[PDB]
Amino acid sequence: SWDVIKHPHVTEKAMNDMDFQNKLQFAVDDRASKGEVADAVEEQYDVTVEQVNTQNTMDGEKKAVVRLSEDDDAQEVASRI
Amino acid sequence: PVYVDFDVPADLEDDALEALEVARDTGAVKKGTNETTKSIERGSAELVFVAEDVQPEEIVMHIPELADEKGVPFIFVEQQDDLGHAAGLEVGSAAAAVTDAGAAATVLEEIADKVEELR
């Protein structure tokens, strides 16, 4: 059975979405839907997902841009990992 | 149908079957075309039964004429399973022969007669 989240996507652009928009980015399995990515995240880091945006990258894997609720602080979550 | 040259009245058939049962519980009966045939050929047959719903007909076509050149009387039954049931079988039967009945010796004696009149 495949897992949804593969690893955080840390790049200058990812850092901004985190600082300025409370969004975290991950490399996910390309069979995962936005909904499956949202649930996966809330359970892995215990946070609330407001919105998810996905893109099928030219690297072969799927990238997801998860925006957290104003109740959580992206930077903080990203920091522990 | 092609081997049938006269129609038997439902009533007459009902009689004949009733007689075949007492002939199998008292006298002697042959179940099956081959046994019936040998019977007619050996002379032991007194009354032979032939179903009318036999497909293919090759199985019985011969009876009618064979029976004639043996003086053996024969009667038709509209259905194959009825005759088999009467012969005491859990399956249908295309032909049955009463080989010396019992307690029916008279009852069937007239059946043979009634048929003759029926051409």
Partner: protein, 46 residues
């Protein structure tokens, strides 16, 4: 043109496949990517 999800995975692979042979592999083997390709000079399948 428009690419399907599968066509994208393939092109994606062909891209990664188009790399230098790790500097260290040349040491380990005491001294070439024969499948190195160029977008203009070569032609991929499909």
């Amino acid at each position: 043109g428009k690419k399907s999800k599968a066509t994208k995975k393939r092109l994606a692979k062909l891209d990664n496949q188009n790399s230098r042979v790790p500097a260290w592999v040349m040491l380990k083997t005491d001294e070439r990517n024969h499948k190195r390709r160029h977008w203009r000079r070569n032609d991929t399948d499909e």
